[PDB]
Amino acid sequence: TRIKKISIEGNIAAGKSTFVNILKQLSEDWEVVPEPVARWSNTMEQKNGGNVLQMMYEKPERWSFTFQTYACLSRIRAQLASLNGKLKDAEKPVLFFERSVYSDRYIFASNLYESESMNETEWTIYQDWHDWMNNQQSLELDGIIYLQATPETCLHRIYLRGRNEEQGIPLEYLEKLHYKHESWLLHRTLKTNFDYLQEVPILTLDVNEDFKDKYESLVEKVKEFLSTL
Amino acid sequence: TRIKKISIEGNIAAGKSTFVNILKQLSEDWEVVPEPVARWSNTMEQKNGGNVLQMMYEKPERWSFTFQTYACLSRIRAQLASLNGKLKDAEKPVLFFERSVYSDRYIFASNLYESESMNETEWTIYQDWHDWMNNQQSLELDGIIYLQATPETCLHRIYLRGRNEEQGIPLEYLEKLHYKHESWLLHRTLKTNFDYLQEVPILTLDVNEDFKDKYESLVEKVKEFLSTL
Numbered sequence: 001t002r003i004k005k006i007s008i009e010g011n012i013a014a015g016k017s018t019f020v021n022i023l024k025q026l027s028e029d030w031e032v033v034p035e036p037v038a039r040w041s042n043t044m045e046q047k048n049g050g051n052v053l054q055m056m057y058e059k060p061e062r063w064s065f066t067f068q069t070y071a072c073l074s075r076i077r078a079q080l081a082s083l084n085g086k087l088k089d090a091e092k093p094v095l096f097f098e099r100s101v102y103s104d105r106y107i108f109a110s111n112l113y114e115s116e117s118m119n120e121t122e123w124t125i126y127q128d129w130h131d132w133m134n135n136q137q138s139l140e141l142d143g144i145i146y147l148q149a150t151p152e153t154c155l156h157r158i159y160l161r162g163r164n165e166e167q168g169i170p171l172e173y174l175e176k177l178h179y180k181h182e183s184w185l186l187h188r189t190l191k192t193n194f195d196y197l198q199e200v201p202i203l204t205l206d207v208n209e210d211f212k213d214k215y216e217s218l219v220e221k222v223k224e225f226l227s228t229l
Numbered sequence: 230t231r232i233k234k235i236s237i238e239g240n241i242a243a244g245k246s247t248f249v250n251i252l253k254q255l256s257e258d259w260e261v262v263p264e265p266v267a268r269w270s271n272t273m274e275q276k277n278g279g280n281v282l283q284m285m286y287e288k289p290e291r292w293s294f295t296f297q298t299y300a301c302l303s304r305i306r307a308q309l310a311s312l313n314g315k316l317k318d319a320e321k322p323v324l325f326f327e328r329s330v331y332s333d334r335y336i337f338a339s340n341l342y343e344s345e346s347m348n349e350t351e352w353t354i355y356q357d358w359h360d361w362m363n364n365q366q367s368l369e370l371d372g373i374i375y376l377q378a379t380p381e382t383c384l385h386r387i388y389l390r391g392r393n394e395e396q397g398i399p400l401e402y403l404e405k406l407h408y409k410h411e412s413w414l415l416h417r418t419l420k421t422n423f424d425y426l427q428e429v430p431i432l433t434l435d436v437n438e439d440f441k442d443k444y445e446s447l448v449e450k451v452k453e454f455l456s457t458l
């Protein structure tokens with residue numbers, strides 16, 4: 001019938017990829033769209049993405065605009081493919097997105113503008129493109145699940161995951177991203193150009209405690225949340 | 230009824246803007262979509278476009294990717310607005326485009342890649358974006374009018390138009406762009422990712438002679454061409 005679209009949102013190493021790979025296995029009616037950036041961080045898209053990530057490590061102020069435009073295009077096409085491809089025989093189909101086009105713009109691209117990694121022209125061009133790319137519709141969200149973790153938890157989990165290039169990420173960076181998620185999804189103080197988001201249902205889950213082998217309470221909250229949508 | 234879409238193609242200062250402003254006045258069934266880049270060269274789009282042009286003059290190898298993506302997005306939205314906005318009461322509606330999404334990629338973006346103003350990653354990301362942006366359709370061309378002028382004519386006409394920043398453009402640059410137009414529209418030796426273009430009708434018009442006050446023979450050829458479409 002009609003596919004429910006749920007975004008999983010959270011800071012770096014909150015546990016989004018772990019949570020989404022738990023969920024995908026619990027129902028034939030449940031599908032997942034991993035974040036393209038995450039997959040490049042692990043083919044023409046993956047070759048482009050790998051080069052852009054490596055170029056970003058050296059010179060974020062040169063590559064942030066190129067990176068953010070390609071990350072968001074890659075997400076839109078991957079979300080559309082799943083929407084048009086999967087769950088067509090499902091009774092209660094749910095598609096779980098690892099992050100959204102809204103996190104791309106209002107968390108990451110925003111944060112890069114604020115660190116002077118994009119100049120005003122790059123940021124205004126990006127926002128104009130984003131406003132338009134997201135009208136040329138079927139991707140609007142039924143709900144958001146916020147995986148809430150402390151900067152410290154996320155810093156610990158970056159260490160656990162053990163990607164070389166990420167070991168350099170400092171707590172202060174994580175605390176800024178954390179602040180942006182809290183403004184957007186808890187306090188709802190963040191203004192956007194997408195009216196409907198103001199009223200989209202949000203489930204906040206505390207994931208500071210390890211859930212890898214003990215997630216039943218979280219999934220019960222997800223099932224309850226889904227029945228309200 | 231159904232709007233005919235005709236692209237006017239030609240080298241820098243061939244006379245496209247002059248020709249299109251002649252045509253627009255000859256029929257209520259005839260509308261025109263100027264090239265956004267041309268308009269920036271004369272408002273949020275114009276402010277962004279003016280900054281990008283100025284940044285390009287200094288450092289083309291820094292701004293070519295950003296410039297080409299914004300030029301082509303600006304063209305797509307301006308072509309779609311005219312298609313959805315105008316000629317709705319017309320008997321034989323024709324929309325004349327100053328250049329196309331195909332010139333953007335196969336003439337300009339291509340030429341910038343070939344002058345090492347974009348690296349391979351920028352060029353592959355641009356082509357991937359272009360292939361996709363042009364599927365998320367109603368912009369496909371019924372015909373192309375090629376305004377054919379010598380590099381020398383175009384060099385003379387740059388001098389006539391008298392834009393400060395353009396007086397630096399050298400004949401060798403114009404001769405490369407000229408070669409690309411000849412490959413694409415006369416010899417049809419240029420391969421693209423758009424099958425239908427191989428078989429699109431092309432009218433070639435020699436505009437080496439001044440036509441500003443003597444264009445009736447050209448318009449007669451345009452009217453004959455249109456009756457075949």
Ligand SMILES: Cc1ccc(-c2ccc(CN3CCN(C)CC3)cc2)cc1Nc1nc(-c2nccc(N)n2)cs1
Pocket residue numbers: 037038053054056057058060061068071072103104105108109112115116117
């Ligand atoms: C790969 C990489 C490389 C480098 C840096 C980086 C390094 C340093 C800084 C500090 N500032 C100091 C001040 N200076 C003037 C400018 C740089 C800032 C960012 C970040 C990354 N990763 C990133 N990933 C995303 C992202 N992830 C998922 C979805 C999405 N949409 N976006 C955005 S950024």
Ligand SMILES: Cc1ccc(-c2ccc(CN3CCN(C)CC3)cc2)cc1Nc1nc(-c2nccc(N)n2)cs1
Pocket residue numbers: 266267282283285286287289290297300301332333334337338341344345346
């Ligand atoms: C505004 C500007 C500023 C500068 C240069 C420029 C300067 C010098 C060079 C020489 N090479 C030497 C080798 N070096 C490694 C790299 C530069 C190349 C280009 C061109 C422009 N104008 C342009 N307009 C378009 C365009 N126009 C309409 C539609 C569309 N889609 N695209 C494309 S480019």
Ligand SMILES: O=c1ccn([C@@H]2O[C@H](COP(=O)(O)OP(=O)(O)O)[C@@H](O)[C@H]2O)c(=O)[nH]1
Pocket residue numbers: 010011012013014015016017018019157158160161162209210211212
């Ligand atoms: O409850 C958890 C959640 C995550 N992790 C680990 O923390 C790291 C970050 O998780 P993930 O990659 O899912 O984070 P994302 O960036 O996807 O939010 C990984 O090594 C996980 O295996 C963990 O040990 N327990």
Ligand SMILES: O=c1ccn([C@@H]2O[C@H](COP(=O)(O)OP(=O)(O)O)[C@@H](O)[C@H]2O)c(=O)[nH]1
Pocket residue numbers: 239240241242243244245246247248386387389390391438439440441
């Ligand atoms: O038959 C012509 C065509 C053009 N021009 C002049 O040549 C310059 C370039 O024309 P246009 O701006 O139309 O060129 P485009 O870049 O639009 O092809 C302008 O000063 C025109 O007024 C001219 O004198 N006679």
Ligand code: NA
Pocket residue numbers: 023024025026027028029030031
């Ligand atoms: Na599943």
Ligand code: NA
Pocket residue numbers: 252253254255256257258259260
């Ligand atoms: Na007209």
